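yo, Photoactive yellow protein is done. seq:
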Amino acid sequence: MEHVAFGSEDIENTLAKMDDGQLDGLAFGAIQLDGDGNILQYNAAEGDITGRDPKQVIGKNFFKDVAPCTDSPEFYGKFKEGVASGNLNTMFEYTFDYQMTPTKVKVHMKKALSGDSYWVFVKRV
Ligand SMILES: *C(=O)/C=C/c1cc(Cl)c(O)c(Cl)c1
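structure:
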């Protein structure tokens, strides 16, 4: 296991060193999105939460195709406001229910250190 806690204040610094393999060592789901919501990285813990195969979702549009239940002001709206502003750091609970048993999670979105990239972190609640 990579020893990083969900919600850590410096999480973007810690995850900046991680290739796809290190990311798979986290205790929580981690997705990296570009500013348009395309999936750049998607770790094993996230796949365990959602059932999706991490390798297959990379390159897909998160808000349009993968996760339409997040296409709402409560999730996508927060993301895009952060992308527009350049300073995203928001945490909230949410239910994932698209083609899956509804699953309640805690979501933390945070701007990455790599230029136009944004993390979505997820854990069960
Ligand atoms: C609602 O449609 C959510 C779906 C969903 C959310 C996340 Cl974070 C995720 O990783 C997947 Cl594959 C689907």
